[PDB]
Symmetry: C3
């Protein structure tokens, strides 16, 4: 009867409960024990973006890239490999220009020309965004109130944290990721697989990531011989 | 040629046609014959939320919970089990605090701190939302015009009805569901499975639902012995 | 170690790379060699919608349908088969009224009563939208700036192009599609399959498409005997 169905539903809920729990546990285990070889530090990227946040965001883009190439030669994609690629993740739509990416880090220019918002993603990685233009509203888990951030500010998305993010038209930022970068690909590609069906954008995304990986491998081989 | 491909496509469309049709028919059969044991009634929840809609929505939250505990003891989750959990469904992102849930009913606090909107879901359940703060725009199926609702109003999402819903930042409401509650889980979890990949939020969602079910089972056992 | 994992990840990225690439290649092959039997032309639909863009969009709807029936008898669905059906695709939510659809073309009334936006879709089809009311913001791939279009304007979504689209509440338009129409169904239904779970809307969508196909088949049989 009604009690039997309640018990069976509770059994199935406990089944999904322990599956999701152990999946989170494995995410924590893979992440905490993951490698931590760091070329950059988030304060370095944040100060460099905050210095040029008063410029037109495209002029800021160029000066940030030139400085990143001067201070970290061999770790930034050349001009021929820079490309604006749409990003559809967690219900929002923006675009990116990948500058650096490895197993443990990534650096990219991010933003949107449309009003958008959605889920931030939850992963074992520390993501930081320094706003060059526009507005960035963040709604943290466990709260009923959100906060808006402006050019010059830096939002630090902590490891294991989940937020709601919302950007206005013409918002652009410099983004630095640190942690277990591969564990973020599922979030980055989900809306392409199950919503947009934009397989050429998927092609673009894995192409620039593979190029960034090959750049790091080529530089690591040259630093040893 | 062109006529052959048109016929084959029409055959496949009829295939998807009869599959979706019989799936809807089974949804109607399971729902109409589902159980209907009711602890609350929607007018009770709506009047209680409308009375406190003039307060700060968090003060309203507390007074509504206290009143629901006084009038329905044994059917509201204790303070230790209350938690704000993100809800990603039908393209929108809000958050909930589950107070009561069974096979046939649920009562929760709902809202969002970001501008969001999307599909309401179509299921065999009668959902009603009494706005405490913010704005609630509803766009009904079969019409080209939408309506906006304000604090004190109650939107009644009818059984089998589908709407587009849109909430502004800082909109909060009291929500009561009545019907075949399990048939709504697929809509509630879809964007977590196929977009956000937020498995810890999924863990949170099934945990509070299982706790609410266990509360109802514990109370039903005590009312008999 | 770290180099081994980098190589393995690069191998898997190249795997996804060549899969998505050949899927795009097959999309191009099917599309370029697809049939091109055309009842309408986009300038015809655009001028007819632009003439009536100064009217109330519902009065414009009726006059456009009457004119399309007068100039293309046997290719427009009768009043009994006209229906507003929700469209959930690429993260946005609108609604449509299908007037004509074949293997190579389609004509429909489109719009939304809510603020929405998302991915446009990428397919081998040329889509054109003439705005009757509201605002249409388009963000093209490879750019950091978007453009807004107004009643009387026509946006032409080119073959293979991907954009971000965003519409304000009360935006309505006349839409004409030309190309390999079946290759667009996956984009049109994805958010229904993996987000909204609205199987009755899916039932509605394949019903009107099958009816439009059957209309074209019936007219083609009568034009020969
Ligand atoms: C998916 C994510 C991380 C989460 C960001 O969301 S955000 O709101 O915190 O900015 C968006 C974002 C944009 C670019 C994504 C990045 C994750 C790592 C990705 C997939 C690569 O290896 C190449 C491009 C990278
Ligand atoms: C999924 C749904 C019902 C549809 C609501 O959408 S709404 O626009 O009508 O408010 C959102 C909503 C929020 C909480 C959801 C509820 C359905 C039943 C759920 C999944 C439980 O057992 C626990 C939490 C409940
Ligand atoms: C999916 C798409 C094409 C892309 C449009 O997006 S848009 O931003 O370019 O307007 C939305 C749109 C609406 C109606 C869709 C159409 C594609 C072809 C569809 C599925 C049919 O056979 C029947 C209804 C048609």
């Amino acid at each position: 009867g009604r009690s039997v169905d309640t018990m069976a539903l509770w059994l199935g809920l406990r089944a999904v409960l322990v599956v999701a729990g152990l999946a989170v546990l494995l995410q924590l285990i893979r992440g905490w024990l993951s490698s931590k070889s760091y070329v950059f530090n988030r304060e370095e990227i944040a100060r460099l973006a905050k210095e040029h946040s008063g410029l037109d965001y495209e002029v800021a883009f160029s000066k940030i890239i030139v400085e990143l190439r001067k201070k970290h030669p061999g770790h930034i994609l050349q001009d021929e490999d820079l490309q604006w690629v749409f990003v559809n993740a967690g219900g929002w739509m923006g675009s990116m220009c990948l500058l650096h990416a490895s197993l443990t880090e990534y650096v990219l220019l991010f933003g949107t020309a449309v009003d958008t918002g959605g889920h931030s993603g939850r992963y074992w990685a520390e993501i930081s965004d320094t706003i060059l233009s526009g507005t960035f509203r963040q709604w943290k888990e466990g709260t009923t109130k959100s906060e808006i951030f402006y050019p010059g500010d830096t939002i630090v998305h902590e490891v294991g944290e989940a937020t709601s993010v919302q950007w206005s038209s013409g918002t652009w930022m410099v983004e630095y990721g640190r942690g277990f970068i591969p564990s973020t690909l599922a979030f980055a590609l989900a809306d392409t697989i199950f919503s947009t069906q934009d397989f050429l954008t998927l092609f673009y995304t894995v192409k620039v990531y593979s190029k960034a990986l090959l750049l790091e491998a080529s530089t690591h081989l040259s630093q040893l011989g």
